[PDB]
Amino acid sequence: GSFLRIYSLHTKLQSMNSENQTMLSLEFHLHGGTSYGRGIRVLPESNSDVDQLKKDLESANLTANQHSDVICQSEPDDSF
Amino acid sequence: LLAPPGSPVRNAHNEILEEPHHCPLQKYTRLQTPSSFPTLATLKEEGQRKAWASFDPKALLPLPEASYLPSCQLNRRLAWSWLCLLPSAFCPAQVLLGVLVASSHKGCLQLRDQSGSLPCLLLAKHSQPLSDPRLIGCLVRAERFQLIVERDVRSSFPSWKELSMPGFIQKQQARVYVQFFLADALILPVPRPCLLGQSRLFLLCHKEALMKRNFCVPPGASPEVPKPALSFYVLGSWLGGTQRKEGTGWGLPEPQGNDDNDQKVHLIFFGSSVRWFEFLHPGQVYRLIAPGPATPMLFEKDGSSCISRRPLELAGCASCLTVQDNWTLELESSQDIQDVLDANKSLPESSLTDLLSDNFTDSLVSFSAEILSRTLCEPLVASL
């Protein structure tokens, strides 16, 4: 659950799969060495960037409009 | 109502010597049971009885609309509903009675008596909240009230067909409380059994939300690491300096500095002092009272006090003040304050241009609104 920043994360689109069917998906890679500024940084909760990340997560959770999980809707019972 | 005064006086001579003698027993009218006073427990447990007796999903999810619902939406539709009984219509008409108290473990008001307790929502009058701390402990009688019952259900019905089946209503919770106007109630002070103080006035800007908060390590005092507890705090501005108990009244203020910073203050309520939440409202002046020996720096500032505690969202602020669990507040409405109180009878509302606009996504609003409907929301509840 940590808030995280990445530096110079490479981005690479697929266009083919191992059965030689064309299909599209976007890969993400942090290749070896800190060259070109590559690295990671564990973000503290004090910075407004982390506030914005958490806020966008909260917004995407509330105004979500996706299909509801936990179809067995009797499961929770709150902090039982 | 049933027997208004003015009946003729009983004359014994006539009662004995009249030929067709008339007396309170001679001619009478049979009486239909006019009213009864329930123990608050039997009222509460009539609520939690009629609620589940009348709860039928096939009336809440009608046809043909219900035919097109997936199970998730079906149960989300069914998972909250409300009932309003108005028990004064029952035969015999039930009459609510109990001593009103403010429960310091929740801040909410309660009607209480020897049989239990019932949460209540008093209103002073239509569109004006209960504002006066002096009602604590009075015996409230109300015979024109609403008994509300909120029902929470965690059903698992697959489709409209199974709404005839019993086995799927896996959990049921009610939440019965009462609500009425003070104008419709009669209020009596309970008699007593039979057989050294400083005060100050202030106006409050606005009142934070009542919720569980954690606190900082005390400044200038023992560093007892706090833990979450129910609390709130109020922004306000002192009026005048400290006053002293003076027999039938409060003496004139001690000299008070004019500095604005010395006027504006954060009253911090936590612990058993939370019982004052329901009475404080913005835009009115309250006379806080502290019993005990008159003491400098009692209201002028916190400055330094034993195990002082500021919440995290209020840490470090200079003009904070922990209200002690044995202090009390009195509503003040004297005419000399009326021009400041002219803010009352009106409530701040932002414009529909402040709302409903892309101008900003970082600021706060206030408005009046009728509620159109309320339902559970699942993504923030369980899905994510």
Swiss-Prot record, chain A:
UniProt site (DNA-binding): 8
Effect of residue 38 to Q: In TPDS3; likely pathogenic; decreased DNA binding
Protein name in UniProt: Protection of telomeres protein 1
Family: Belongs to the telombin family.
Lineage start: Eukaryota, Metazoa, Chordata, Craniata, Vertebrata
Region described as DNA-binding: spans on this chain: 35-38
Whole sequence portion shown: 236 to 315 of 634
Compartments, record wording: Nucleus; Chromosome, Telomere
Expressing tissues: Ubiquitous.
Transmembrane segments: none
Subunit-level organization: Homodimer or homooligomer. Component of the shelterin complex (telosome) composed of TERF1, TERF2, TINF2, TERF2IP, ACD and POT1. Binds single-stranded telomeric DNA as a monomer. Associated component of the telomerase holoenzyme complex. Found in a complex with TERF1, TINF2 and TNKS1. Interacts with TNKS1. Forms heterodimers with ACD. Identified in a complex with ACD and single-stranded telomeric DNA.
Clinical disorder: Tumor predisposition syndrome 3: An autosomal dominant disorder characterized by an increased risk for the development of various types of benign and malignant neoplasms throughout life, with age-dependent penetrance. Affected individuals can develop neoplasms involving epithelial, mesenchymal, and neuronal tissues, as well as lymphoid and myeloid cancers. The disorder is associated with elongated telomeres. Cerebroretinal microangiopathy with calcifications and cysts 3: An autosomal recessive disorder characterized by intrauterine growth retardation, retinal exudates, global developmental delay, neurologic regression, intracranial calcifications, and leukoencephalopathy.
Function: Component of the telomerase ribonucleoprotein (RNP) complex that is essential for the replication of chromosome termini. Is a component of the double-stranded telomeric DNA-binding TRF1 complex which is involved in the regulation of telomere length by cis-inhibition of telomerase. Also acts as a single-stranded telomeric DNA-binding protein and thus may act as a downstream effector of the TRF1 complex and may transduce information about telomere maintenance and/or length to the telomere terminus.
Swiss-Prot record, chain B:
Top-rank taxon: Eukaryota
Subcellular location: Nucleus; Chromosome, Telomere
Subunit structure: Component of the CST complex, composed of TEN1/C17orf106, CTC1/C17orf68 and STN1; in the complex interacts directly with STN1. Interacts with ACD and POT1.
Family (UniProt): Belongs to the CTC1 family.
Job of this protein: Component of the CST complex proposed to act as a specialized replication factor promoting DNA replication under conditions of replication stress or natural replication barriers such as the telomere duplex. The CST complex binds single-stranded DNA with high affinity in a sequence-independent manner, while isolated subunits bind DNA with low affinity by themselves. Initially the CST complex has been proposed to protect telomeres from DNA degradation. However, the CST complex has been shown to be involved in several aspects of telomere replication.
Disease implication from the record: Cerebroretinal microangiopathy with calcifications and cysts 1: An autosomal recessive pleiomorphic disorder characterized primarily by intracranial calcifications, leukodystrophy, and brain cysts, resulting in spasticity, ataxia, dystonia, seizures, and cognitive decline. Patients also have retinal telangiectasia and exudates (Coats disease) as well as extraneurologic manifestations, including osteopenia with poor bone healing and a high risk of gastrointestinal bleeding and portal hypertension caused by vasculature ectasias in the stomach, small intestine, and liver.
Protein name per the record: CST complex subunit CTC1
Source organism of this protein record: Homo sapiens
Taxonomic lineage of the native organism: Eukaryota, Metazoa, Chordata, Craniata, Vertebrata
Residues of the full protein shown: 513 to 915 of 1217
